[model samples]
Target: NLAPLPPHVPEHLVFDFDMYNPSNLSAGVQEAWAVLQESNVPDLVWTRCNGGHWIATRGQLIREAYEDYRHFSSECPFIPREAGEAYDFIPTSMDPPEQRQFRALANQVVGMPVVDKLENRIQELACSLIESLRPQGQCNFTEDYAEPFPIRIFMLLAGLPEEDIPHLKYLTDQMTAPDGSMTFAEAKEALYDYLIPIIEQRRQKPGTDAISIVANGQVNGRPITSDEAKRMCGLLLVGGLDTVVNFLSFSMEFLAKSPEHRQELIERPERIPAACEELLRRFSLVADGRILTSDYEFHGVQLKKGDQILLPQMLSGLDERENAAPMHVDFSRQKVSHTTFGHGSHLCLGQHLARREIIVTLKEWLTRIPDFSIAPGAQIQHKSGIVSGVQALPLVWDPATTKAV
Candidate 1:
């Protein structure tokens, strides 16, 4: 149920697009959101679907908006308003200067060096997960490999119990794609409740784990407060649990459906890393917005103060202006461009670890299970929200076709 259009919004600028459940979602999540880039669509338009927020449809505007955080504050980055209001994930919730301090600490946790340390575990887990599933010749990829691979590595890195995944994952999911079961505030509070005691204990008895490092880490030359540590750690949990988990499933689903694409990687195993980049561009997900600091005219359109504008990170790569044949997945795509991880200061801190997980899955999975396809008669469904995801990926193959190695 959409409320009446705001008096200031011109009707022509409105293109009622729902972030949670796009009308064309059944076709594909990317395809559905790509509607905003249709020939007839404007570079920027106001969507009345999710409480009438403005959307930057093209890569140019999206990048510009993200880069100019002065006017476009990250104070409210989620849709339906309430979620953004409740989004208090440190580093992410703050902008520049202040945000940079926490980001440095965040980088200390998930930056390239951390990924280097965890590289062995990431590679081994991908091997273990794929090897265990190879003989089956059939598996629900989302649950079987996708969830466990990156997640177990994250658990090991965070020094949290593997058993805590279900609870933490649920809370993380609620933050990104709520099922109407819990409000964002409720979900966030629940996550904090779970982390509070653990954060307290870690502060008293620090260790090398990510949580302990952040729990007792210094920010801006001052020891971070318990509340600050909790906020930051909560964000770490969400990133570790959610971002790469769904991405693996989406990438795997695409591989299952496209033989030529899979062969492209199989024939040139060395190109898997490049293939990983292309897949990330093509299947890119994650959409969040920023709040307006003051009324300003952007690209000839008048925007009001307090208005929320969605600068979808997912749309940047898909824009034809940025990448020709934007939707096509080309392994040899010479110049892959997009803000998949994000743009400006808010670029993802966990990207190094994410890339390793993706590249390992591609190289290891394809080596053992060279051939696989979707389960018969099973339709792959896509869900659109802050992060888009493959609902389920039922892949099947003959055990004889899979190599034990």
Candidate 2:
């Protein structure tokens, strides 16, 4: 005899879905996690798909995991510890005293000043990209504008060539969208090999590029070494190119369907920044987890030492208790509360730039082409993982209805 899957459980008793979607994620990444949030379910559940792990479906517990670094170590911050370790970078990898230096270097590269200095360039690139594609009448949003726009801007800032992006982008796709394309170990090694020569060249005599800046930067009074530089640079490059590339696509796909939402922004362009923040809160795509260091019981559930807990990083606010209609994207929602950029000590350092780029696109695109939607007969997709994203977003617009910028 066996028990049936109940409608809901208590506030605890975490359930594991063991979910992994290797196909047709063109819809969105949150679908699988959405199961835990259905009307009748409980606060937590244990899922054992892909790499069996725990998911904190509610806000309070997830926040506790992110803030209490001692209890929940970011050391193994992704499913399958092996891949997570490879994905680790400076500052993010190092926990404390040593971590501070790399984090500072990260700030130097993508922080407020750098982002501010490049503000005009960011907006210009976004507008330029949109203009080039808007006339197509039908465009694959993922490839045409969303993917290249941010990568190009970041590359120009880093002094890297756009030519190399195709290769690196493929490697990055494997990082999160693994489907027997390449193993994580293989991808990591390939990226390291590719970065080696560049790292070596800058070590001897640094340039004005972002990579060189971090390569030759000083951490806590001492100059950063070549190894230190490569480690940090690798992380930043992957993030700049991959994460937001996927994010922009996801946003556009949503906006294309939400004409009223787009109209709101077009009507009040000044509200774009607030819109970006709301979107970040609404559809956070990252799903990083942490490890438990010592034995302890979390709400009566005995989480033993060496046991691993998987926090989706994207699910904290999905619970009804934390958010009103957690799935709805209300641009006008008052008091939007969520930790989409993460929380506490591990908050995303590159978030400022990422946000700027997003706002630039939202404002620039809406100003030019206020009316657009997913092309009929075409499909838009979203993939999942550490930095989940869209597979393809083909959108069509009637440029004839609006004047050219």
Candidate 3:
């Protein structure tokens, strides 16, 4: 829906870029958003799309806005107003001092140590899933591997039932990228309803699972309330379920098409980590924004009090200023810089776990099936939302070309 331009907005700065749905979306979500960084587009522009919000098209402005939370608050971090207002997930919704305490609790669940403890399971799952499909020689990568690999591990850690994936995943997906079936609040409440009983159970009898830790843990020297546990646990669920599930498809889709890039990672296994960084930069997904606290002139553009400006985390890496060939994936490119996860105090807590998952998939998959490619006549499709994803990835390979490792 196109929104009416506000009187205060300058005519030259107006561009209609819908974050939820864009005109060139069929091409690819990242490609669609790359239009913002074209040589002609302004660094900071106001979009008369999605209820008229400011957009920082350059990495510089995006980083500055994220770092300066006093003026640009995370109070309402999503578009469509209602969703942002409904986004009450612990540290993400709170800015700075209030945000930090909750982040400590979140870290306890998803931090480096937690990732290390689960390292064995993560590696085993990647290998187990890959080997299961290696002999089949053809499969829908999105359904068979992309969705299962990371999500199942997360479920195991969260102490949630695997049978609940379809229902729980649908709810989480709706919140990030709505499909008209539900609103953000509805999706969030459905998720909370599912967790409410579970959190209560966890509190009564704690376990080693992430939910138990959050439900029974302390925050700021006080035992966390049931409401706090739900809010924080809800964030953990969203992070666990959504982020890497889509990313693996994007990375694998790239590998399926580019033999040269695959060879680089295959031949020099050590470069998988660097390749993960470059892939993250090129295929960077996930976008959320902030609400203005007061009227302020940023980069010569006037932003009104309570106005929303989407500083897209996806666009930051694609900005040419951030990387010389921002769209090109180069593993050995000496330097890789982007705000893909986030910037400032609210950077993604589950990032360490996400990186491990990506690296493990690359090393494990390439070691077994080094020569797979997209199905002969398949047309890969992409969908856009808060987090972009592959509609389906139909991958094919010869069983003879694969080895059981």
lDDT of 3 at 277: 92
For each candidate, C-alpha RMSD in Å?
0.9, 3.8, 1.0
Position 287, candidate 1: lDDT: 94
Q: What is the TM-score of each candidate against the true structure?
A: 0.98, 0.92, 0.98
lDDT of 2 by residue, 1-405 (tens): 113322322324645454356333433576666666677665556554555566677778888877787777776676776776665667676665567777877888888999999999998898788778777777888889888998998888888889999998888777666778798768766777777788778778878788888878898888887777777777777788888888888788889999999988988888888889778876787777777778766765656555557776677756667778878988777877877788767788889999999998888888878888887887655666777777778787897754456
Q: Where is the poorest 10-residue window by lDDT in model 1?
A: 1-10
Off by over 4 Å in 3: none
Compute the lDDT of residue 328 as modeled in candidate 2: 92
Whole-model lDDT values for every prediction? 0.90, 0.75, 0.90
lDDT of 1 by residue, 1-405 (tens): 785888888888888899999989988899999999999998888888877899999999999999999999998888878888888989998998899889888888889998998888888898888888998889999889888888899899888999888888888888888898898889999999998899899999989998899999998888998999999988888888888989998899889989999999999999998999888898999999999999989998889998999999999999999899998999999899988999999999999999999998898999999999999999999988998898899999998988866
Ranking by TM-score: 1, 3, 2
Which of the two, 2 or 3, has more lDDT? 3
> Higher-TM-score candidate among 2 and 3?
3
